[PDB]
Each structure stands twice: as structure tokens, then as C-alpha cells.
């Protein structure tokens, strides 16, 4: 007997029209987090584990957990490749006390997202089997090279899981295998997953809101840190140049990529096996030599030397120009950002866009 | 970056000093003009180069 009277004017005079001013911070956000100059698992094999159990039908979020999960998964899949084309993805669904590898080890969002679209039709059935899921995953990761960061991300919806044997078998194996596992839980903290994640070197987090769900996923987009226990390798890599059918396709037959059915007349050949690949980067399914484009390498070098947060202040007390450096414009906002090194004037968009998207400060390049 | 050695080469300090001076002096003595903007001969010649059968 309180909801029709729950407005701010229920027991106040000024709240009759200042109610949305008193409760004005109702829907906003402001994303930022820390960083560190530590080794990163730039070569990344991340596998996604998603509950396929009846509990995924619950409406803890706006739509059922399944729809909200798949919605954010697609977005996460996109940015994961976008921020690391070198890495690869795979998906496993934990249904009927069993686990089904929705997607194999690959780096093609086309196939991965296509699988998601189709996976929207899945049937939430039975209880989850964390042991079966980790079995299929580890069985696959066993064959992956030690230097490639073998990681798994788990999305847990239920609280009870059917394991055919104590998961300590897998955790002891995973720890010895140096594989890393992280888990994202829905509405609750489970000891099983917490111990599993903390012991395995990953982290257990719980979803609060779709924004929090993105906030957590955002952290998993950045490559994990690496220790000296992982193989510090000197992996062989190919940088094949694109080659069209320039000579009227002469002595250059069109061919389908190892992964694709599209017969491409021009593209990237394998310097190791001369295979035809329409896209790059692509792993040589018939050689083991990975082929990567020179710009994709530089695309990740920001993680090696990222920017630092700029000095924030409510006013340009330093009395720089009335026009914000970088992007020209008036200091219309009573909050200013100043680079520690170059000390130029930066605005809200500069601190956000330059540090989170440009990753380079103009005055530091000078 | 991981780029091979370019064909870059420095000049003489005189050329640098003269470059800073000559360009400063040119920009001090400069005004926009339609004739300096374009000529039909230049445009047509450039159209030939850009034509569907051009170089």
C-alpha cells in the first residue's frame, strides 16, 4: 500500500515538481577501470560456456536470461574479434546434464554469430554438467599450443550442476594444464564456481543489470595477464601479401579457402603451402602456420603501451586557452582533463575518446 | 614499427634554413587568385589522365 504513494511528493512540498530533480541520477553511467603494464595473453583461445538448463528461461533480466545472454554474447563476440583478430572463439552449451560444443575453435564471427542466431531456438532442458563442459573444452585445449592463452568464460544461470565426478579432477588437471577459467554468474555467488575460478586463475562475477553484464563482459574483452609459467614462445607467423588475378587469371586458378566454400580468384596465398584464402588473418588448416596481416599486429600494440588517465579538475584553473586542445572548442563543461606529460587541455570527450579509443595522446606525440 | 628501411635522406642545413626562410617569405607575400586556382588546360589535361582510358 505504498506504490501509488512512492513518488517524491509523498511527504515533501518541493518534491511536487523537483521529484525528477531529486532522483535525477536514475539511468546514467560512467565506465572506467584500471590497467597494468604486465604481460598479456595476446594470443587468445577463449571458449564460452553458457547454461542450457531450464533455469535459462527465467526472467531475472528484461527478457529471459537466454535472450539477454545471447543479445550481449553477439555484441561481445563482435568486439572480441574487433579488439583481437588474432584470437579465436568457440562455444559450448551445457544442456541435459550434457554439453554441446555450439561452435568449434575458429575466428570467424560469421559462423559464430550465425550459430548464435540459430541457438536462439535452443531448448532449455535438464540440469547443467560443469564437468562435461570442462571435459569437452580441456579435451580441445590439450591440443592447443602452451603459449596460446587457453581460456574459458562460463555463464552460469542455475545453482546446481550434475557432475559425474568431483570437479577437483578437472581443476587439478586445469591447474596443471595452466588453463585459465573465468565465470559469470546470474544473481548469485556459487562456491563451486568461485573456488573453480579463483583457483584456476580466473574470476567469478555476478550479473546485476544488463549494464553490469556488459561491464563484466567488457573486462573479459581485454586480454588476460600472463605469468612465466606459460610458454614464452617465438611463434612462427606468416604475412602473405594479397594477390589478385592480375594477368587475366593466367596460371592463377580461383580456389575456395581451406576454412570456406567461396571460390576466390584473388586473395592471400599461403607462403608455406600456397593454399588460397580469401580472408586474412586465417590459420593454415593444412599447415599450422598462422597468417596475419601486418596491420592486425599493430592493432593490438596499444595493449602494450596504453595511455594513462589525465589530470581531472572541475575548472581550467591552470588557465589554459578557453578552447580545449585536441578537439577545438570552448570549455563549456566545468570539468577539465590535463595530460600528465604534455599537460595540454582536454575535455570530457578527449578523456573518454582519446584514452579509450585513440589510445594515443596528441601532445605526447609532439 | 616493423617496416623496412625507406629511401629517406637529409639535406644540408643551408637547404633547411633556406626552406624555412623561403616558405615564410612566400607566405608573407601571398594572396589567392582565380588564375592560380585553375586553368582549362590543366583541368582538361587532368581529365584526360583521369578519363576511363587515361593513364
Amino acid at each position: 500500500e505504498r506504490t501509488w504513494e512512492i513518488l517524491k511528493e509523498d511527504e515533501s512540498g518541493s518534491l511536487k515538481a523537483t521529484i525528477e530533480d531529486i532522483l535525477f541520477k536514475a539511468k546514467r553511467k560512467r565506465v572506467f577501470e584500471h590497467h597494468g603494464q604486465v604481460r598479456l595473453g595476446m594470443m587468445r583461445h577463449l571458449y564460452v560456456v553458457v547454461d542450457g538448463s531450464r533455469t535459462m528461461e527465467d526472467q531475472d533480466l528484461k527478457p529471459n536470461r537466454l535472450t539477454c545472454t545471447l543479445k550481449l554474447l553477439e555484441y561481445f563476440v563482435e568486439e572480441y574479434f574487433d579488439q583481437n583478430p588474432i584470437s579465436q572463439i568457440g562455444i559450448i552449451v551445457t544442456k541435459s546434464k550434457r554439453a554441446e560444443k555450439l561452435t568449434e575453435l575458429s575466428g570467424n564471427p560469421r559462423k559464430h554469430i550465425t550459430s548464435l542466431k540459430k541457438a536462439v531456438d535452443m531448448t532449455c532442458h535438464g540440469e547443467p554438467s560443469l564437468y562435461n563442459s570442462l571435459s569437452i573444452a580441456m579435451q580441445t585445449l590439450k591440443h592447443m599450443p602452451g603459449h596460446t592463452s587457453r581460456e574459458v568464460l562460463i555463464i552460469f544461470s542455475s545453482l546446481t550442476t550434475c557432475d559425474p565426478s568431483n570437479i577437483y579432477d578437472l581443476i587439478k588437471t586445469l591447474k596443471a594444464a595452466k588453463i585459465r577459467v573465468s565465470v559469470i554468474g546470474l544473481s548469485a555467488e556459487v562456491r563451486v564456481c568461485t573456488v573453480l575460478a579463483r583457483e584456476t586463475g580466473g574470476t567469478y562475477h555476478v550479473i546485476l543489470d544488463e549494464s553490469h553484464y556488459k561491464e563484466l563482459l567488457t573486462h573479459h574483452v581485454s586480454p588476460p595477464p600472463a605469468s612465466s609459467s606459460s610458454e614464452c614462445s617465438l611463434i612462427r607467423m606468416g604475412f602473405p601479401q594479397h594477390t589478385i588475378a592480375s594477368l587475366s587469371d593466367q596460371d592463377a586458378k580461383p580456389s575456395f579457402s581451406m576454412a570456406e566454400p567461396g571460390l576466390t580468384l584473388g586473395g592471400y596465398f599461403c607462403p608455406q603451402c600456397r593454399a588460397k584464402y580469401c580472408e586474412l588473418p586465417v590459420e593454415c588448416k593444412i599447415c599450422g602456420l598462422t597468417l596475419v596481416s601486418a596491420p592486425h599486429l599493430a592493432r593490438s600494440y596499444h595493449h602494450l603501451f596504453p595511455l594513462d588517465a589525465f589530470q581531472e579538475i572541475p575548472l581550467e584553473e591552470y588557465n589554459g586557452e578557453r578552447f580545449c586542445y585536441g578537439c577545438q572548442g570552448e570549455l563549456k563543461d566545468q570539468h577539465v582533463y590535463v595530460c600528465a606529460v604534455c599537460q595540454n587541455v582536454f575535455c570530457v570527450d578527449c578523456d573518454v575518446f582519446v584514452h579509450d579509443s585513440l589510445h594515443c595522446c596528441p601532445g605526447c606525440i609532439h | 614499427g616493423p617496416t623496412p628501411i625507406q629511401s629517406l635522406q637529409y639535406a644540408t642545413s643551408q637547404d633547411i634554413i633556406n626552406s624555412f626562410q623561403s616558405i615564410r617569405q612566400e607566405m608573407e607575400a601571398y594572396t589567392p587568385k582565380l588564375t592560380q586556382v585553375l586553368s582549362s588546360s590543366a583541368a582538361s589535361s587532368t581529365i584526360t589522365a583521369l578519363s576511363p582510358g587515361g593513364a
Binding site: - | 589567392p32 582565380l34 586556382v37 585553375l38 582549362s40 576511363p52
Partner: protein, 452 residues
């Protein structure tokens, strides 16, 4: 009612100028601003090619120019080509050997060039070194004044009190066919075209209203080219800056007085020689207000799926417009509530208003909260609004001459062949040997029927 309902033929710049004489257009192209107005109105196809060709005096071959656009878009490029040539912008010149070279009218070329870069005149603009004017007028005061003036003209069509206008302007509203002369003394009355105009948006309204003024301009002895050039210079003017009436012909002075009375320009006094152009004049161009609430001023009609209209408007004019096609339910100080219904929309339809006018009228005035969605008007409303006219716009009338019951099929096939020969065939029935021909062929075919 031998033909369909009278429609307000909205003729953009192309349709209007497309009928003018080349010398008139050449005189019009005399000013740089007139060229820019024409140029900016061109489709992006023409817009680029003209800019690309502006710096040449060599007749580029028709084929090479046409080969600048991809195979599939070359067909759409023909539209811009037909326009540029039809608008005298493109004139063919012959290359050695008679090849079809293309050249832009040098006057237009030179004025666009003088528009972009210095020329003998500095855009025909000057400050006259005068200081800040007496009784300074502010930009918002200019907008409101222009708005008030425009509202007064719309109010005059609505026939509301205090709508003060000159009889020559009231006459023009009747002369243009907007205010019907159904009664002596010209009491407030409106034609289908006038209602369509009332529901039309401000820029298209002002545009077509001024086109009617121009259609009567030489009947009124005003200078078409001069007024047009002046109007284009005004469209390229600035709100806050001052402009002078120095060196303006009496024809321009008469028009300027109308232009002032019309609220497109603000003057210190009718006799003053310095003025400030209003937002309406700067925005006076053949363009579109938008698919939702107007960019310049937001909409106020909250159209709802239950056909309920919640117009956050105080304006008796806007309210009275809503009453034309919708049944009004309540009047509240800050907002008005109404509902669209078959009867009220059939009133608009019977008054000769295409449902698209209502749809667009509501769209252009759709409250900003209704935005942020692809369809601003729910499909059910859009469909039923159209369905109401499609219910009662199935009967289509057409005046013609019928040829029937000939002596044989040879007569029918001969008359049909003659109708086909002259292209005067409207419709025919080959089973009963019936043919309908345009009325122009009435005498020709009636007399031929005696000869065949």
C-alpha cells in the same frame, strides 16, 4: 466533376524555371547567388558534374561525360542530364568532326566562378560602412515577427479576427485560387488547394505562395528576374547582419514593401534604407521540413495508436487546422485533445485533401517524444487514414468522347488504328467494338466517321 478533385500542383524550382525562356534564365544567371540557388537545388548527380566541369571551356564529349557514372546509375544520371540541359545549364557544342561536346552556359559558369572566387562584384554585397542601426532588432524578435506575419496570413485564410492584410494580398490569395470567391465582398472562404496549402509546411507554403506572386508579378508589372535574384541573395543573407535598400528599383521597393508586410524582412520604417532579413527568407528554399517534428521548431502533436491526438498547442490556428480532419474532444490550456475519425477525415477528403497531406502534416508536427523510432505515425493510423480515402476515392472521372456500335470490326480496327495513330485513344473494348477518345479528336473523328 468531370475530372478528379483539384490538386495544388507543387512545382519546385525545376518545374518553375523549366518553363522560362533561356534569355530570362541567362539574365537570372546574371547574378552569382541565382546560380548558387539553382545549383544547390540540383540533385547530387548534377551538383557534382557541374562542379567538376566548372573550370573548362572545352566541349567535353557527351559519351565520356555519361561514362563518368556506373552502368546501373547512368540511367538515373539521365535525370540530372535532362534537367541540366532542359534548364539551359548544359548546351551542346561540337568538337572537331562534329562530336557532341558539352559546355555549361558561360554566364552560369562565370557567376558560379565569381561566387566561389573574386569577381567584378563582391557578391553584390556591401555594408556601406554604416554603424549599428537605430532601434536595434534582435534575431528572436525577427523570427517572432516573421512568424506573427505568416500566422496572420494563415489566420486570414482561416478568416479569424485581427487578420490584418492588404486587399491586394487578400486579392492575391483569391487570385491564386486559395481563397475561393464563393460570395461577394470576398468573405473568408478556402478552396481545396487552399486547404491543402494550409496543411502544407511553411517552406513549401512560402515557396508556392511566392510562385503565385511571381505568376502574377509581371501581371503586376514586377521584375521576375530582379525579385528572384533579390530573393536568392536574401536566402544567402544573415539574420543578425544588416542589409541596405540602396539602389533598389521601385519594382523591388513595391515587392520589398510586400516582403516587409509579409514579414520576410524587417524595416525600421517603410521608408528606411536598411533592413534585417528574417529566418523565413533565409530558409526560403525548395526543400523539406522533415519526416518528424521540425528541426528548427519541434512538433507538438502526440499522435497515439488509439487515434487520439494530444497536441501540446495553444495556437488557435494550428488547433483549427486539426479540427478540419479530426474530431476534437477537449481543450486544455497547454494541450488539446482530439481524435481522427472516418467522418472527420471524410470531411477533409470531401473537401479535397489527400490523406498524405494529413500524414505529412502530422509528421512534420509530430511531438519530439514520438521520435526516436522509424515510423513516427503508427502503421494502423497511417493505413486507416489512407484506407478512408481509398474507401471513397475509387470512382475516378475522365471527360472523353465515346465511339461505339460501328458497322463492323473493320471500322473499329480502323478507328482504333486512327486513335493509335494520333495517340488520342483513352480506352477501348474490342469485344463490343467500343472506343473512347480524348475530346480533342471529337470533331476530327466524327467527320472521319463519315469517310473512314
Amino acid at each position: 466533376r468531370g475530372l478528379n478533385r483539384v490538386h495544388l500542383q507543387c512545382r519546385n524550382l525545376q518545374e518553375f524555371l523549366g518553363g522560362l525562356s533561356p534569355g530570362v534564365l541567362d539574365r537570372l544567371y546574371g547574378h552569382p547567388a541565382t546560380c548558387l540557388a539553382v545549383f544547390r537545388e540540383l540533385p547530387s548527380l548534377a551538383k557534382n558534374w557541374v562542379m567538376r566541369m566548372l573550370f573548362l571551356e572545352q566541349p567535353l564529349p557527351q559519351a565520356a561525360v555519361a561514362l563518368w557514372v556506373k552502368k546501373e546509375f547512368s540511367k538515373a544520371q539521365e535525370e540530372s542530364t535532362g534537367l541540366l540541359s532542359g534548364l539551359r545549364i548544359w548546351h551542346t557544342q561540337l568538337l572537331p568532326g562534329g562530336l557532341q561536346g558539352l559546355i555549361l552556359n558561360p554566364i552560369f559558369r562565370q557567376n558560379l566562378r565569381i561566387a566561389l572566387l573574386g569577381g567584378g562584384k563582391a557578391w553584390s554585397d556591401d555594408t556601406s560602412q554604416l554603424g549599428p542601426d537605430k532601434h536595434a532588432r534582435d534575431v528572436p524578435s525577427l523570427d517572432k515577427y516573421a512568424e506573427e506575419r505568416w500566422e496572420v496570413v494563415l489566420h486570414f485564410m482561416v478568416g479569424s479576427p485581427s487578420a490584418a492584410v492588404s486587399q491586394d494580398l487578400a486579392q492575391l490569395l483569391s487570385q491564386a485560387g486559395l481563397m475561393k470567391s464563393t460570395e461577394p465582398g470576398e468573405p473568408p472562404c478556402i478552396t481545396s488547394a487552399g486547404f491543402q496549402f494550409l496543411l502544407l509546411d511553411t517552406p513549401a507554403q512560402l515557396w508556392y505562395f511566392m510562385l503565385q506572386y511571381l505568376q502574377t508579378a509581371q501581371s503586376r508589372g514586377m521584375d521576375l528576374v530582379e525579385i528572384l535574384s533579390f530573393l536568392f541573395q536574401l536566402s544567402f543573407s544573415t539574420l543578425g547582419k544588416d542589409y541596405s535598400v540602396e539602389g533598389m528599383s521601385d519594382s523591388l521597393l513595391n515587392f520589398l514593401q510586400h516582403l516587409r508586410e509579409f514579414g520576410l524582412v524587417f524595416q525600421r520604417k517603410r521608408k528606411s534604407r536598411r533592413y534585417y532579413p528574417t529566418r523565413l527568407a533565409i530558409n526560403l528554399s525548395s526543400g523539406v521540413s522533415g519526416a518528424g517534428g521540425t528541426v528548427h521548431q519541434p512538433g507538438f502533436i502526440v499522435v497515439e495508436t488509439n487515434y487520439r491526438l494530444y497536441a501540446y498547442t495553444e495556437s488557435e490556428l494550428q488547433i483549427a487546422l486539426i479540427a478540419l480532419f479530426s474530431e476534437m474532444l477537449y481543450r486544455f490550456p497547454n494541450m488539446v485533445v482530439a481524435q481522427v475519425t472516418r467522418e472527420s477525415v471524410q470531411q477533409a477528403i470531401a473537401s479535397g485533401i489527400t490523406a498524405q497531406q494529413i500524414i505529412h502534416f502530422l509528421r512534420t508536427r509530430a511531438h519530439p517524444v514520438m521520435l526516436k523510432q522509424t515510423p513516427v505515425l503508427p502503421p494502423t493510423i497511417t493505413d486507416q487514414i489512407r484506407l478512408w480515402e481509398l474507401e471513397r476515392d475509387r470512382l475516378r472521372f475522365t471527360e472523353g468522347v465515346l465511339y461505339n456500335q460501328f458497322l463492323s470490326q473493320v471500322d473499329f480496327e480502323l478507328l482504333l488504328a486512327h486513335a493509335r495513330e494520333l495517340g488520342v485513344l483513352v480506352f477501348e473494348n474490342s469485344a463490343k467494338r467500343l472506343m473512347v477518345v480524348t475530346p480533342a479528336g471529337h470533331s476530327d473523328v466524327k467527320r472521319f466517321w463519315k469517310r473512314q
